[PDB]
Amino acid sequence: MKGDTKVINYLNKLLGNELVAINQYFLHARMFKNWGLKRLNDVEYHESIDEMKHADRYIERILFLEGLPNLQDLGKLNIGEDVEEMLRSDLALELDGAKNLREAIGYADSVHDYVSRDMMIEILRDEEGHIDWLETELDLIQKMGLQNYLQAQIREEG
Amino acid sequence: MKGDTKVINYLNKLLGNELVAINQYFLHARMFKNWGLKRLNDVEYHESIDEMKHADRYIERILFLEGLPNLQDLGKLNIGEDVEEMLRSDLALELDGAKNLREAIGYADSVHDYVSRDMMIEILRDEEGHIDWLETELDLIQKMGLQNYLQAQIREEG
Amino acid sequence: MKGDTKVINYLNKLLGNELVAINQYFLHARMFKNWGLKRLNDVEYHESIDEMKHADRYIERILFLEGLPNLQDLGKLNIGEDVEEMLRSDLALELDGAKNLREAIGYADSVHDYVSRDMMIEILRDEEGHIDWLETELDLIQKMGLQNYLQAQIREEG
Amino acid sequence: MKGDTKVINYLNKLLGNELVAINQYFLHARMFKNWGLKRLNDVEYHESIDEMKHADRYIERILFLEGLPNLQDLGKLNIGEDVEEMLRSDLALELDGAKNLREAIGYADSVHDYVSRDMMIEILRDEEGHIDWLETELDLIQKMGLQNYLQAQIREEG
Amino acid sequence: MKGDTKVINYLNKLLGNELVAINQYFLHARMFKNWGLKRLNDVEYHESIDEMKHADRYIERILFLEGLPNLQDLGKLNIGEDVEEMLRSDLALELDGAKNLREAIGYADSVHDYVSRDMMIEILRDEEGHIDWLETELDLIQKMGLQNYLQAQIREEG
Amino acid sequence: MKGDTKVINYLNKLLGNELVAINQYFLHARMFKNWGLKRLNDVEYHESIDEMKHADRYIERILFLEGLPNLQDLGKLNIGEDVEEMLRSDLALELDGAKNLREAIGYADSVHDYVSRDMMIEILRDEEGHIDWLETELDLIQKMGLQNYLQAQIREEG
Amino acid sequence: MKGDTKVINYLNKLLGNELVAINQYFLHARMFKNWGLKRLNDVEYHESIDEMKHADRYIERILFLEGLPNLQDLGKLNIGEDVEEMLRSDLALELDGAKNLREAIGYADSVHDYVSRDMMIEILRDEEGHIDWLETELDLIQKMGLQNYLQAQIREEG
Numbered sequence A, B, C, D, E, F, G: 001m002k003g004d005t006k007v008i009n010y011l012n013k014l015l016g017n018e019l020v021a022i023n024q025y026f027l028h029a030r031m032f033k034n035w036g037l038k039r040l041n042d043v044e045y046h047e048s049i050d051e052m053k054h055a056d057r058y059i060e061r062i063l064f065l066e067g068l069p070n071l072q073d074l075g076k077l078n079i080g081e082d083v084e085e086m087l088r089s090d091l092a093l094e095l096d097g098a099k100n101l102r103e104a105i106g107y108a109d110s111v112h113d114y115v116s117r118d119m120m121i122e123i124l125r126d127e128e129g130h131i132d133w134l135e136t137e138l139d140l141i142q143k144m145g146l147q148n149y150l151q152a153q154i155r156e157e158g
């Protein structure tokens, strides 16, 4: 079914964001794992899988709407060198992605692509859950101190 | 444990190949799915998951050897427009990757990084399995004709 | 128990036929497998196992009758280069073997080696089953055409 | 995938060794069985099946590498007339095969056929297990005497 | 159904052989048991049951063919006084019985009593199995020595 | 099977390393246990069992190759007096052992003892896993502080 | 809890005996295994595990009593070259160890270290069981002869 060209461009742009998050969250995960921060590896890896699911949804949607998914262009990764920097970087990435999502959702509505909108709203809901987790972790680092925070990561939950 | 710098560069180069295959196989898969070629979507998607597993192994190994995994640089995808072109493109990608693997395996041996070698040999074994499948499919297209070939893809196995 | 010398020679000759069929059917099987003709690999391989069972029966019988099983001499294999040629070659091999079996069965009867005869009749029954399958497949190639025939081989049954 | 021609020749040569062992171990097995040496029939027969598995691996590998498996040429069998001679003959056969394997493994490495090498190393590992068993049995014959050795073979284990 | 008179006479003669074997094998069995040769008692007793089954088949067949089964005349038993003599005596008895069976099978064929023939061939097959076991045991006595042979009989298998 | 003399010497040298690790890891384990550091006792003890498995492999291999395993000479233990010193000492021991392994693996290859090589590569893979764990623990001590690190050891996982 | 210094020295001396037995029994076990003497490998290996358990008890006890377990000094192994010599050597080792145990048990009593005594009495009980087994085996060698003795070892029990 021929979709609206601009919806397709938004979908490719969102896909682009997901491709960046997939890689950044995957590397961050295995960095945590290497450091023995098991709990962080589990969450971060499952966050990477989640973005893969999102990418898959965009790819299928783009294809259905008869556009060309773009997996060739990869935006800037921002890989941190310590736990806090890594988490802040993920947070900034999510915030930028939410921004793009809000714009796309608004536009899809005004061209009546309600199923693209509906798919994007579920994704935004998942992203806000991830933003919440990131914000909470960053606050915990500050409230309990880094040493205690790190110790709390060495065993998986539960 | 500080690894050999050049082994790390090889590992990053191989990781690079996997990142390309992950994306190319994933797009190809969902293209097949869109076309209703269920059997091809299943194999191609599972081939994409397989390259993700390979990437994961390289990432962990690089990290253990104390290098920096590079997930920022993404080589050229070659996305085909019909089934045969897609499969040929995957085949050429695998052949180039096997070439790189053989070189890395040789070099790891001569610096005594036997566990990197051992990991790379398992990966090469998986790739040759994939090359075999690709070669066989391409020959089937020719032997049974495209119409029959396509019909044979519309139901998953078994 | 000292058997009739000539029965032993027949048994060794039949064993000879089985040794040829074992190898020819095994190679043919893995050729089909390589080509992705799964259904043909299954039947052909199980036909190879069957001839191994026959060889085993001859070997034990020869030994019981106090002769020397000959596994040293291997007759001519006729390995085909395409599906039809392979199947025709197996068919001609079975037909020649049935011929030898009929002679041996007749002779065993006239020297009263009724248990050798009885064993050979079961084997002839298995061979005629195999001849029937071969004849039927060859006719299918012709009736449905090679392209359809090949497509019908790519998935195992059932 | 077009393999190295010389690797293919080695593979055919090793296949040749397996074809000889398959037959020799099978006859030896049923000789032991005829003599009521149940334990020896079980081991020897399972050693024959093992060489069949090896042959199968060579055949598939040769085919994948696009060469012609040779099952037509059968080397010299050396069938013994008593238990010790049979076992010594198997031992000499294994030792010659290990020799050929070592050469092939070395050569495959230098042309970078690492998966052929890897397959051949698993096979060599199985052969050395068989050599160990043979050497041990032959020593037992000598240590306990032939009469005791034979008595120890009449019931299967365990 | 009125059978051929001469087939009936053969059947009565074979029945005669079975009656002798039943008794001889039964006595031999309980002699072995008395001597504590458990393994030999088990085989010999089950050989006695087997000949009873054969007798039963002849009796039913004779009756069906409307003749008179003769259980009144009992041929010569040859009871041995030591293990080897007992086994040799059983062997000679089986060999004489096989001789009679071969003649009867030939004759039944020429008068078209194919079901009598078919029954006699199954019996001959059982007898040749028994001959094989006897021949093997006698050879074991010689190969391992009597003392070892006897020791190997004192526990049942398995 | 007579092995290469120098391979045997390497195997005895590696065995020597294992004997030292077995004892050092065992004492370190029960020191941790005494201190109530349950988690460390579990890992360290299981690391001791692991080196026992390695020793067993060398012993069997040496014996098969017809050499004399040397369990008489015991190298220097380096037993630490606090957690960090103990772990650093294990780490230095593993690093020295990896060094010896790499040399032996290289040499086994050049004399074609591919199964000794293959066994040694599996062992090196286990050692690198242990090195990774040690490096990670030592970094955790530093990142979370000793007090937090110790507290994290008092309950077993999970 | 600060233990008596001399009890600690005894405990270290007994530990020393266990370290020797661990190694000697382990090598002897795998020698038996190499020779195909399965039954002897099982008992001897389980005897080695048993001495490891004893060593573990001494190590924990020494640590609890606040001494330094000594795993650095390894007494003389006496590795035999044939079955009888190996068993005699183990027997002499056990006898010397029982001697040391009796002295230590007496002394622990007179300084009121009743729990060290109680632990040592359980160990002495295990050693006397092992002495009994050794004495019995050595007598069997003599009573049945070496050839019969060896044959009785080739299958595990039961």
Ligand code: HEM
Pocket: A019, A022, A023, A026, A049, A052, A053, A055, A056, B019, B022, B023, B026, B049, B052, B053, B055, B056
């Ligand atoms: C960039 C585009 C990618 C897409 C569209 C994608 C898609 C997917 C999907 C749909 C799954 C199944 C979810 C699940 O396992 O439950 C998956 C699994 C997985 N992915 Fe990705 N992926 C991508 C890239 C990557 C990369 C770069 C890595 C890094 C190594 C990776 C690592 C993994 C791993 C380890 C699994 C689990 C394997 C399994 O157990 O099945 N993926 N991916």
Ligand code: HEM
Pocket: C019, C022, C023, C026, C049, C052, C053, C055, C056, D019, D022, D023, D026, D049, D052, D053, D055, D056
């Ligand atoms: C010469 C090339 C041969 C090849 C490549 C080959 C291959 C095989 C394979 C792959 C199996 C199945 C293994 C398993 O899963 O257990 C098998 C089974 C068997 N083979 Fe062969 N074989 C060969 C020759 C022979 C010969 C000459 C004999 C002698 C009679 C023989 C006797 C048997 C028997 C009795 C079985 C088991 C049948 C059953 O009960 O399933 N084979 N063979």
Ligand code: HEM
Pocket: F019, F022, F023, F026, F049, F052, F053, F055, F056, G019, G022, G023, G026, G049, G051, G052, G053, G054, G055, G056
């Ligand atoms: C030095 C040469 C040694 C060798 C070759 C050796 C070998 C082995 C092997 C193969 C196992 C069984 C592994 C498994 O299947 O889990 C084992 C278990 C064990 N070892 Fe050792 N060992 C040695 C020394 C020691 C020492 C010095 C100690 C210290 C006390 C020790 C303590 C133990 C313990 C406690 C077990 C487990 C017992 C059980 O619960 O079954 N070992 N050993």
